[PDB]
Design a protein around this ligand. Structure first.
Ligand SMILES: O=Cc1ccc(O)cc1
Ligand SMILES: [Cl-]
Ligand SMILES: [Cl-]
Ligand SMILES: [Cl-]
Ligand SMILES: [Cl-]
Ligand SMILES: [Cl-]
Ligand SMILES: [Cl-]
Ligand SMILES: [Cl-]
Ligand SMILES: [Cl-]
Ligand SMILES: [K+]
Ligand SMILES: [K+]
Ligand SMILES: [Zn+2]
Length: 315
């Protein structure tokens, strides 16, 4: 007897594709790699309980290729497997509301993700892939498992791998509309003179070398190709926020002078991130953990600042 059930395949979990599957063959024999809300059913034969459910598959016809690219903005053939493999884990994570923000209870070295997710909720940023727009909306309401799985997939990180917040923010910014952001810098060398540079997009909102936005406006010392020390300072800035990053160092965070910041304790390959947010006082969010203080000092590695338009007075 040949038995069949009706199921739906998908790449974006919105547009469904009707399939009648033979229950005597695995999903893999019929669709290739097949996933049920994260679980790999490629080697499973259809159950009766599967009738009417949706399965993710690879984009193995033109319709699915277009649906997949329009939704995810990637054509990495390995994305689906990485996304599903992460989602199996992030579905089991907990997403507490901490001081009104969606956080992540610690698991699987996910501190860098919690700090990034907390940061996102405090800066103005619109994602370009509908997949991130949709999942981020749900993350803000507290159901962040799909968003975290997507971030892991876009960043090419596996669950358990310790990521870097700055790197993660860079990936997130690459998938956001920052076309309006503009930065103008001046570099002054006593030997070589002045050199002005204009940066746009992601490069206009990220800096590596100093944590202080004020010091960046005043001027920072950097090597010149002639061997001497040159001074670089901020000429103009058009963006809704800036990110200042630096190798972890003892740094003093003052209430009201910044938006939020990343603290990193440990060494290059192994450590722990914490998040500091400046509200009515200074709150330190460490996954599900929350403490408060009037002053904060610790190994800070990223600081976020609000911005709209800045123009130097340095002549
Ligand atoms: O390219 C991303 C992608 C995501 C889910 C799929 O089912 C297939 C492709
Ligand atoms: Cl089976
Ligand atoms: Cl709350
Ligand atoms: Cl968005
Ligand atoms: Cl969730
Ligand atoms: Cl990383
Ligand atoms: Cl994008
Ligand atoms: Cl950009
Ligand atoms: Cl600020
Ligand atoms: K962009
Ligand atoms: K662009
Ligand atoms: Zn020089």
């Amino acid at each position: 007897e040949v038995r069949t059930i009706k199921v739906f395949t998908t790449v974006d979990n919105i547009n469904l594709h009707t399939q009648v599957v033979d229950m005597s063959m695995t999903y893999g024999q019929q669709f290739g790699p097949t996933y049920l809300d994260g679980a790999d059913v490629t080697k499973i034969k259809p159950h009766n309980s599967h009738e009417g459910k949706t399965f993710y598959v690879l984009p193995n016809d033109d319709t699915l290729r277009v649906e997949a690219f329009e939704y995810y903005h990637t054509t990495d053939p390995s994305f689906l497997g990485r996304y599903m493999s992460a989602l199996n884990h992030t579905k089991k994570w907990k997403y507490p509301q901490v001081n009104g923000l969606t956080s992540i209870k610690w698991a699987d070295n996910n501190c860098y993700l919690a700090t990034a997710l907390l940061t996102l909720q405090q800066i103005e940023l619109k994602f370009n892939p509908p997949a991130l727009q949709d999942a981020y909306y749900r993350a803000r309401a507290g159901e962040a498992a799909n968003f975290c799985a997507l971030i892991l997939a876009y960043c090419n990180k596996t669950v358990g791998e310790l990521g870097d917040v700055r790197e993660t923010m860079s990936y997130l910014f690459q998938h956001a509309n920052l076309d309006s952001c503009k930065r103008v810098l001046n570099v002054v060398c006593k030997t070589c003179g002045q050199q002005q540079t204009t940066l746009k997009g992601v490069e206009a909102v990220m800096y590596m070398g100093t944590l202080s936005y004020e010091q960046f406006k005043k001027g920072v010392q950097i090597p010149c190709t002639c061997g001497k020390q040159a001074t670089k300072y901020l000429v103009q800035q058009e963006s809704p926020f800036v990110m200042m990053s630096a190798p972890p160092a003892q740094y003093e965070l003052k209430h009201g002078t910044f938006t939020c910041a990343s603290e990193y304790t440990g060494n290059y390959q192994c450590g722990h991130y914490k998040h500091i947010t400046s509200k009515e006082t200074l709150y330190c969010i460490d996954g599900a953990l929350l403490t408060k203080s009037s002053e904060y000092k610790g190994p800070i590695t990223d600081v976020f600042y609000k911005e709209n338009s800045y123009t130097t007075t340095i002549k």
